[PDB]
Each structure stands twice: as structure tokens, then as C-alpha cells.
Amino acid sequence: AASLQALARTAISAPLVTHLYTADPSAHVFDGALYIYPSHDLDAGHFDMADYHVLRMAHPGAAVEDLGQVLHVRDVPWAQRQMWAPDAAQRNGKTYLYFPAKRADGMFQIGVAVGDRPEGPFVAEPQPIAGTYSIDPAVLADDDGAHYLYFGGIWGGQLQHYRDNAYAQTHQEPVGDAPALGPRVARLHERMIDLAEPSREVVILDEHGTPLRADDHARRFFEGPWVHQHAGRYYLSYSTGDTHRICYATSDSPYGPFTYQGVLLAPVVGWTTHHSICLFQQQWYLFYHDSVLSGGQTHLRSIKMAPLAHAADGTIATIYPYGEDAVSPW
Ligand SMILES: O[C@@H]1[C@@H](O)[C@H](O)OC[C@H]1O
Ligand SMILES: [Ca+2]
């Protein structure tokens, strides 16, 4: 109402684009430029996305280019609907677009599409990646040359229906003192369109080295994992869903276990929160989204960016998207 107008006035970022609704930004530096692979929210006059665009910043501070639509669900034979939060990777001169979509039978899986350029167009594989399920893929290009796929989202994302990579209708989200579910991780094969191994659960620990509890909604994993490397450590960051933050944890291994550190992003306007963290020349950035452009509509978002800093001790200061003095939307 007027509480949202206050946030709009003190927002630290403006929508990087406004001619289309965008969400779940996955930022990468490919071929000397910053490419962003977001979802494309559609306004039906309800997360029913059907296609993906690719955005680019040629250099820091540059205007954002909309490189156009690069993949539509009609060219994904195994998928019926809901083209959700994607990501990209490069290897052997190819660019791969990883995306979650829903099969006709209602189950999410992660597919991949291949192109010869970062802007595509991408030709989707006929089937989804074997061993994948749930949503929100993130592909880490490790400094050592390997690529790792991270995925998972609870609630609507369906990760709660799986244990040890197998689906069960009676599998539900854990409660109380039971450990909360973590994202999945699997090294990718050199061909990039297949996993090189079955995925494993990524464990997030508290200050005492104990796994996060299911009843710890302030810190336990909800959706949208992202991993970046900095100062010899792996940083796992993710959304907490119902508590609306992007939190992060650290490990000396891409597989974890990751020890919880703190909140990386405070609550944004709109129920969902999703992000990526990417180094572009002289600056790390947090890419995120909110629903301010749409007037607070959770399903119609816009992506944003902000400078991010690692402190000398490796920690990352909380980013307040409408200022630290703002009344939090959640
Ligand atoms: O993947 C995103 C998902 O994490 C969120 O739940 O809803 C929007 C999707 O785009
Ligand atoms: Ca993501």
C-alpha cells in the first residue's frame, strides 16, 4: 500500500530490466561479458513460465541488453509447463542451459539445452537429466576444472518427496528435531548433459557442528542453492523460503558439509527470494529479485543487482535491499 511505496523509494537497486518480468537471476562471466540467465514471469492480464531470455552487461555499469528468447517449453519434449529458475555453464566451447520444468504427470525434473554461444539459441535435449528431480539448478564451474550441479526446493519444488534420489508419494518434509533437507549435489560428466554420479545430499551445520533442524526455518534450506568460490572456501547460499532470506554457509569442499554463517540478503518485496553471486572485474555482485515493479505481485518479479563484499575474515555482510532502516516486508 503505502508501506510498499516506502520500500520502492528506498530500494537500493532498480530493476535491471522493465520491459519484461524477470526472476531467479543466474549471473555468469562468459567470454568477457556478464550474462544473466533469469526466469521470465508472464502476466496473464501462477508461476506459469514457458520460456527463457538471456541478458547481458557488456562491461561493468553497462546498460542491460535483452538478447531475446532462447528456449521455449514447446521445444522441450519431456516438459509440459513451468519453466523455472535456470542456470548456465560453459565447456568445450559450448554453453549449456540448465532448467527445471514439470512433466505432464506433474513431477519436476531438470533438463539441459545446448548452444554454441552464451546467448544461444539452445537446443533442448529430448529427455531430462537422469538422476535429477525437484528444481532450481545451479552449476558451479570449479577452479579445478570440474562442474558440479546443485539442485532442490521444498514445498512446491517437491524435494521433500525424495530420499536418496528416489521418489515416494509418502515422503514428506521432515519436522521438529529431524534434520532439515539439504540441496543435492552431483559432479557433472565431461559431456555436461549427464551427471557423473548419483547426487548426494548437501549438509548444512550450525555453530555446534550439528545439522540444521527441520524446525529451524530461520536457517534451514528451502530453495535456490548457489555456490561460489572465494578465498579457498566454498560458499553455499540459498533461500529460506518462509523466513524470506538468502542465507549462506561455508565449506572447504563443494560437497560440504557447509557451516552456517548468516544472512546474506534481507527480505524482499514479494514472497519469493532468489539469487546468484558473481564476480565481474573489480566487484562481486549479488543478483536478486523482488516484486516492486509489479506493485507487490509475488508472481511478477524483476531482477536486480547490488555490490557484495567479503570481509577480511571471509564473512559476507547482510545486504538490505531497501536500506537497513527500512521496515522489512516480511
Ligand atoms: O524456481 C523458482 C522457485 O524457486 C520459486 O518457488 O518460484 C518461482 C520459480 O521461478
Ligand atoms: Ca538459481
Report the nearest atom of ligand 1 relative to the CA of 224: 4
Widest distance between CA atoms in the chain: 52
Give every CB contact of residue 230 below 8 A, 6+ residues apart in sequence.
284, 310, 314
Q: List the residue whose alpha carbon is closest to atom 9 of ligand 1.
A: 84
Report which secondary-structure segment, H or E, holds 12: none
CA 138–ligand 2 middle distance (angstroms): 6
CA distance 155 to 144: 34
Contact predicate 94/144, CB 8 Å: no
At residue 112, the 3 state secondary structure works out as strand
Contact predicate 233/227, CB 8 Å: no
Q: Which three cell numbers stand for residue 57?
A: 552487461
**Residues in contact with ligand 1 (CB, 6 Å cut-off):** 23-24, 39, 47, 84-85, 135-136, 153, 156, 223-224, 272, 274
Which one is catalytic: 24, 87, 201, 290? 24
C-beta atoms surrounding 285 within 10 Å? 19
CA distance 42 to 20: 8
Give every CB contact of residue 210 below 8 A, 6+ residues apart in sequence.
none
C-alpha distances out from residue 280 to 83, 120, 251, 276, 287, Å? 27, 21, 23, 12, 12
Structurally, the chain folds into a number of domains equal to 1
Sign of CA dihedral 29, 30, 33, 36: negative
Give strand pairing partners of 249. Answer: 236, 260
CA distance 8 to 25: 20
Pocket test for ligand 1, best of 73, 99, 136 (most atoms within 8 A of CB): 136
Contact predicate 7/322, CB 8 Å: yes
Sign of CA dihedral 231, 245, 23, 205: positive
Is 24 one of the catalytic residues? yes
Is 125 one of the catalytic residues? no
Which has the closest alpha carbon to 25: 288, 219, 298?
288
C-beta atoms surrounding 10 within 10 Å? 15
Which one is catalytic: 48, 223, 242, 290? 223
Q: Which domain holds residue 294?
A: 1-330
Q: Which three cell numbers stand for residue 178?
A: 529431524
